[PDB]
Design an enzyme around this catalytic site. Structure first.
Site, PDB file in Angstrom:
ATOM      1  CB  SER B  44      -0.929   0.216   0.856  1.00 30.02           C
ATOM      2  OG  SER B  44      -0.426  -0.103   2.420  1.00 30.02           O
ATOM      3  CG  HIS B 157      -0.385  -6.073   4.798  1.00 31.58           C
ATOM      4  ND1 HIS B 157       0.306  -4.822   5.485  1.00 31.58           N
ATOM      5  CD2 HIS B 157      -0.124  -4.646   3.168  1.00 31.58           C
ATOM      6  CE1 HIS B 157       0.845  -4.083   5.546  1.00 31.58           C
ATOM      7  NE2 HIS B 157       0.637  -3.789   4.032  1.00 31.58           N
ATOM      8  CD  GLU B 166       0.231  -2.708   9.012  1.00 34.48           C
ATOM      9  OE1 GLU B 166       0.785  -2.178  10.436  1.00 34.48           O
ATOM     10  OE2 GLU B 166       0.338  -1.920   7.860  1.00 34.48           O
ATOM     11  CD  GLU B 207       3.456  -5.108   7.297  1.00 35.13           C
ATOM     12  OE1 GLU B 207       3.656  -4.291   6.960  1.00 35.13           O
ATOM     13  OE2 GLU B 207       2.453  -4.786   8.749  1.00 35.13           O
ATOM     14  CG  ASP B 244      -1.621   1.487   8.579  1.00 33.66           C
ATOM     15  OD1 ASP B 244      -2.378   2.404   7.990  1.00 33.66           O
ATOM     16  OD2 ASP B 244      -0.758   0.570   7.846  1.00 33.66           O
ATOM     17  CD  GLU B 287       0.490   3.559   9.708  1.00 27.14           C
ATOM     18  OE1 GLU B 287       1.029   2.929  10.640  1.00 27.14           O
ATOM     19  OE2 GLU B 287       0.663   3.743   8.409  1.00 27.14           O
ATOM     20  CG  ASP B 314       2.186   4.972   5.772  1.00 23.96           C
ATOM     21  OD1 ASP B 314       3.742   5.743   5.471  1.00 23.96           O
ATOM     22  OD2 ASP B 314       1.963   4.024   5.629  1.00 23.96           O
ATOM     23  CE  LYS B 339       5.509   2.130   6.095  1.00 24.03           C
ATOM     24  NZ  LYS B 339       3.917   1.972   5.313  1.00 24.03           N
ATOM     25  CG  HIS B 367       7.210  -3.242   8.834  1.00 25.04           C
ATOM     26  ND1 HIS B 367       7.384  -4.379   9.322  1.00 25.04           N
ATOM     27  CD2 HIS B 367       6.378  -2.649   9.282  1.00 25.04           C
ATOM     28  CE1 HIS B 367       5.787  -4.919   9.892  1.00 25.04           C
ATOM     29  NE2 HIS B 367       5.289  -3.552   9.345  1.00 25.04           N
ATOM     30  NE  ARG B 368       6.369   0.874   3.037  1.00 28.35           N
ATOM     31  CZ  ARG B 368       6.654   1.327   2.355  1.00 28.35           C
ATOM     32  NH1 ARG B 368       7.129   2.435   1.201  1.00 28.35           N
ATOM     33  NH2 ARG B 368       5.009   1.539   1.625  1.00 28.35           N
ATOM     34  CE  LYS B 390       3.480   0.709  10.268  1.00 30.12           C
ATOM     35  NZ  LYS B 390       2.454   0.530  10.272  1.00 30.12           N
TER      36      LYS B 390
HETATM   37 MG   LIG Z   1       1.147   1.512   2.914  1.00 25.97          MG
HETATM   38 MG   LIG Z   2       0.981   2.051   6.824  1.00 26.81          MG
END
Ligand SMILES: [Mg+2]
Ligand SMILES: [Mg+2]
Ligand SMILES: [Mg+2]
Ligand SMILES: [Mg+2]
Lengths: 424, 423
Positions: B44, B157, B166, B207, B244, B287, B314, B339, B367-368, B390
């Site tokens: 994303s 994800h 998330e 993740e 998120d 987020e 983000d 990030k 992270h990604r 995170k």
């Molecule tokens: Mg994203």
């Molecule tokens: Mg995000």
């Protein structure tokens, strides 16, 4: 000066494995300041004769899966036993570790404490020699980049689906070198995700990064992989062949093997016939643990009947154990062994098993566990041993891809052939 | 200072944790020291992230090869940096940005540039014979961060019906970081049992969080609550929640679509929706609750709920000092997700951090969803003193390697745990 290989200190720590369970990592610090580091994997479908994976069994810590006792054994008994000794002699250090534990199955100190120490010493040795790990690990065998068998559909103990067979693997045996082999398997992996998604099947992954759908039959799993291979543009047989890990000790109960997904119950004879029929329908070149770890008469029959046509890998059958492999060689069971360092506990004993296999015409498949860490030791060991085959996971989850990446790094300066179809 | 000079820079293509190619660089100093670093990749991705250069060859890795970026490291970047010193991170990063000479690093690629930036930072730490986090600190008080742990995955994800990307737990009540990791892990394993007992999927998304289908976002929060309780911890005191939403993934044609709940929301309605969630669950951070372009909505959200909850930009900010500056001036959000590969250099990342700190915004080191074995963000989280990280669920080594690196730093760092101070 050779005192530069002398050990100053050994310490350990608890870290998380790729399933979220504690495991042990050891640091071996030499007198020159150099630090060798290594961590230990953990199986789910563990053979009954694997060396002792020492856990704390404290119900208030990590559901009893802590490894502070093994850490304490590295920090205390192992550290003081090895300090001042040289890491130059791998066999001598592994000998001292085994004798310090003084149990057949390494249940005083823990096989995980001993292995963490054994591998960290190997890395400290390599750093001292200023050579890549795989070079320092070679014991005269002709090195090759290994063919990976890639577990892209997970079942059994590694996933909560209805799949009885633990591992459905593809092998890019027709690839011209290792980077292209990785590319081929990766492309098939992503096409398989699309194939599954279009049929409404699960594309979340199990412990080794393979998808975890429910299946109607083992044949459907093989059909789905075949569909992905074809849609990715590769040829069954010529480019890609299949390998299976049945982990049949997990299916054996009350004198029968249970294929619950298919409402089938097989005696040993019927399961051999079952495999013969799969082999006649699909290019399966390797079957690991097709029968139970105690079914030695079954394994002998399987080897006589299909061993000329297929590789037959003992995993739980042998547990990387020279004494057991020797008995299996004498009785003529299997024709390959899955090499798992933490099944036996030292690099040196692992090397014994490899030598015993090579000298008697058995192939070796270098292997991860389903619970992995960031450690990529088995990539260097696969290359160094020249075994020509590695089993280290699907093409997702860094617990698997980190090994594939380490093979790419090795391939840069190693100037080594790809084992390819020679593994047949 | 001769020991800090660059001999050669090279790159290679490796696989990320989703199985897609990404770039890794080795910076070799005249001393023979090698700094190595690899680059993560998001799913994303915000529209204003710096350019992730891909090959777009449909016959190779479904067009996701990064050999063009690798060659830019091997050729242009190596030639431009031969003989320069890694002592001065800002100078190398300035040189890399000037060599690319585009606003979004579309010539060399942000991944090629970032791989070099981070590899240089590692070669510098090794030359100083100091742990990485030590050499990254820029004066801030260092702490072990509170992790927000994404144990139920959705959105981009996973292929489940879950809209929110998330669902995270934060062990804010833990006394130190090893115990915080233990708390999150124990809840993770209990949650697996909770889902398995209800016949819901326990295979994992990108993740490492479970990927079941859900009746609603409240049900997911109820399931996490049940696991926290069965693991023996207390909602609020021990464990709080972070989300998120990645709402830019849900936004289309003036509405936010919660397909899983058969409902759509305008910005005003979605703010109310969050208010009602916050009053029912101990959610301390949200987020990307709104779209990356919904700046009026973000302002309303921040005024209405910003004193009650952390609001993390983000995709809103994409770790970009220029965009963060606009956002601070307009008063939107009160935290930024950091990030490195959204902006492309360590130096520009540090600019974002400092700009956030100087204006009272918190930072969440991140992270990604497509990770590598590289643990840079563990050291950067600690060095920055941001107090929050995170970096994934409690399975998949793409995530646990970072937690393991934090365990390693914790051994000798002698640092406090951020704990409830992050509120
Ligand atoms: Mg994203
Ligand atoms: Mg995000
Ligand atoms: Mg097993
Ligand atoms: Mg096995």
């Amino acid at each position: 000066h050779h005192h530069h290989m002398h050990i100053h200190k050994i310490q350990a720590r608890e870290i998380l494995d790729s399933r979220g369970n504690p495991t042990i990592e050891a640091d071996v610090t030499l007198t020159t300041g150099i630090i060798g580091r290594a961590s230990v994997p953990s199986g789910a479908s563990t053979g009954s004769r694997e060396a002792c994976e020492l856990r704390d069994n404290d119900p208030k810590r990590y559901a009893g899966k802590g490894v502070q006792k093994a850490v304490k054994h590295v920090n205390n008994e192992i550290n003081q036993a090895l300090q001042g000794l040289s890491v130059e002699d791998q066999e001598n250090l592994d000998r001292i570790l085994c004798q310090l534990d003084n149990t057949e199955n390494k249940s005083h100190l823990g096989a995980n404490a001993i292995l963490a120490t054994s591998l960290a010493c190997a890395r400290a040795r390599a750093l001292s020699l200023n050579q890549p790990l795989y070079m320092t690990l070679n014991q005269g065998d002709m090195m090759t980049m290994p063919v990976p068998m890639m577990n892209i559909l997970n079942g059994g103990a590694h996933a909560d689906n209805n799949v009885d067979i633990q591992e459905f693997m593809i092998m890019p045996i027709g690839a011209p070198d290792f980077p292209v082999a990785l590319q081929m398997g990766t492309e098939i992996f992503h096409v398989l995700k699309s194939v599954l998604k279009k049929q409404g099947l699960n594309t979340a992954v199990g412990d080794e990064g393979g998808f975890a759908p429910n299946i109607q039959s083992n044949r459907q799993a093989l059909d789905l992989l075949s569909e992905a291979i074809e849609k990715a543009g590769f040829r069954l047989g010529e480019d890609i062949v299949f390998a299976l890990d049945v982990a049949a000790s997990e299916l054996f109960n009350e004198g029968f093997y249970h294929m619950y997904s298919e409402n089938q119950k097989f005696d040993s004879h019927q399961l051999i016939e079952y495999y013969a029929n799969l082999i006649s329908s699909y290019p399966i070149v390797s079957i690991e643990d097709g029968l139970d770890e105690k079914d030695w008469s079954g394994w002998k029959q399987l080897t006589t009947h299909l061993g000329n046509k297929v590789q037959l890998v003992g995993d739980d059958l042998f547990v990387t154990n020279p004494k057991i492999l020797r008995e299996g060689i004498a009785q003529g069971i299997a024709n390959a062994i899955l090499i798992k360092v933490n099944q036996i506990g030292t690099l040196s004993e692992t090397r014994q098993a490899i030598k015993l296999a090579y000298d008697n015409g058995y192939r070796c498949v270098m292997s991860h566990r389903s619970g992995e860490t960031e450690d990529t030791f088995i990539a260097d060991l696969a290359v160094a041993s020249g075994c020509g085959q590695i089993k280290t996971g699907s093409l997702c989850r860094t617990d698997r891809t980190a090994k594939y990446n380490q093979l790419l790094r090795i391939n840069e300066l190693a100037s080594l052939p790809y084992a390819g179809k020679n593994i047949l």
